[PDB]
């Protein structure tokens, strides 16, 4: 019982991209991934875990697209027109693998093994923006640009830039004289 | 009000409808939208497949249905805060308000509302109710305020729900209230 773990974990994201995370379960991975079904369950005991090794690698799309964004830690660059851009770059990017990425995330609203990871998305983007803006406006700027995102991706509405941006702006305090 | 069987055999009227209806969020609850399906909700609703199929020809059909209902959660928590619609009402504090009570009540049935509302991401024949949600969300302040601020409410309120409900955050009204504040402009005169 070798390094089948990354051909599982790849074949568990190929699975929920095509049937979607209801289709997603051992048998069907180890399908989709050429391998013995006792390798799966070795790899991956539960469910929960290979899906928690799923949306890790998930939260790679995102991800990626903050590391091609130096300006976002620029103390210069505008913060809410480099994020709405962010948002912009990663929403145009693969739809159905954006798509999965969004689904495994929200995944965790029912299964409680997957909030920790889930977090991990935005404890990454509020630590990143922590350092360009207060904490309370960070946790904010997070949840937002998730709800903006989700809005996207549930009303099949076509991201709009500049309204994201103004919609980002109006959460970051102004700085005062002492500032 | 006309009694069953009155216009048409029992199993044809809106009650029947209702019923698979009623059975297809007892499914959703207990099992996760994974296990919905005609079968799943003719067995929860002791009906035969035939009618649902005869009420809901496809999958969509009854998903779509099964959200409307669904929806129904959060909607009456917002018409039990009519204050929402007075003209000097106080819509920050009063919508966190009304996510704390929501986000409140019984998890299980807070789950599968927003898990059937989340199923729209990859079924686009749940969208369009997606869209209809938002606008509706947005009517709420819409037209004391702007198109920005209407179109964003949404937006603020899912991303502070699945603040909450994804990562097993504590709900923060004071919070909520400063983030709706800065979404919503302060009027100049009352």
Not at 104 to 125: D, I, K, S
């Amino acid at each position: 019982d070798p390094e089948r773990r990354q051909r599982i974990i790849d074949a568990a994201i190929r699975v929920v991209g095509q049937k979607g995370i209801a289709g997603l379960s051992h048998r069907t991975v180890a399908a989709e991934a050429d391998v013995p079904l006792g390798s799966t369950t070795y790899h991956f005991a539960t469910l929960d875990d290979l899906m928690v090794a799923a949306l890790r690698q998930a939260n790679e799309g995102f991800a990626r697209v903050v590391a091609a964004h130096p300006a976002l830690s620029d103390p210069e660059a505008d913060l809410s027109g480099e994020l709405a851009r962010v948002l912009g770059e990663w929403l145009g990017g693969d739809r159905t693998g954006v798509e999965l990425e969004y689904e495994l995330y929200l995944a965790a609203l029912r299964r409680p093994a997957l909030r920790p990871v889930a977090a991990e998305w935005a404890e990454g983007v509020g630590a990143l923006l922590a350092a360009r803006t207060d904490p309370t406006t960070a946790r904010a700027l997070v949840a937002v640009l998730d709800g903006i995102c989700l809005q996207v991706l549930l009303t099949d509405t076509p991201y709009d830039e500049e309204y994201a941006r103004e919609v980002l702006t109006r959460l970051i305090p102004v700085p005062a004289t002492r500032d």
